[PDB]
């Protein structure tokens, strides 16, 4: 901002998987989660498995 | 937290006029906790997670 | 960097042997730690040996 100040507005989450190669495509360049692919497993982009 | 009692070994030392004093090796088997970064398969046959 | 650590062109910290003591010297076997160049001012010291 214009007063020597910073603010945050959010932080993008990433999503790992227990298993790739099981995600299916449904047209556009996106993937839908399926059975035999796992739960979402959201997280942050800094550390850990991401 | 519960404090420990540990055995400290000055084994394999020397005193033979090698200039001045300097440590050459220090080790122990304690570590802070952490989570799984990455798994790999070596060529001898094992699977190892770092 | 912005808070006085010896840092390369991408944001990682050059580490070395930490300096401790009054007067500070270098311990030749410690576990390494980042280096900070402090902007604090030297406190005085009483005379003990002439």
From Swiss-Prot, chain C:
It comes from the Bacteria. It is found in: Bacterial flagellum basal body. Belongs to the flagella basal body rod proteins family. This is Flagellar hook protein FlgE. It comes from Salmonella typhimurium (strain LT2 / SGSC1412 / ATCC 700720). The gene is flgE.
């Amino acid at each position: 901002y214009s007063n020597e100040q910073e603010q945050v507005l959010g932080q993008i989450v990433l999503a790992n998987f227990a298993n790739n190669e099981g995600l299916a495509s449904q047209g556009d360049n996106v993937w839908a989660a399926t059975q035999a692919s796992g739960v979402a497993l959201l997280g942050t982009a800094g550390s850990g498995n991401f | 937290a519960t404090a420990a009692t540990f055995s400290l070994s000055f084994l394999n030392s020397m005193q033979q006029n090698t200039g001045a004093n300097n440590i050459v090796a220090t080790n122990q088997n304690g570590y802070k906790p952490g989570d799984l970064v990455s798994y790999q398969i070596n060529n001898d046959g094992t699977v190892v997670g770092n | 960097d912005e808070n006085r650590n010896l840092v390369n062109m991408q944001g990682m910290q050059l580490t070395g042997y930490p300096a401790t003591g009054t007067p500070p010297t270098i311990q030749q076997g410690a576990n390494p730690a980042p280096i900070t160049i402090p902007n604090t001012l030297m406190a005085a010291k009483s005379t003990t040996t002439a």
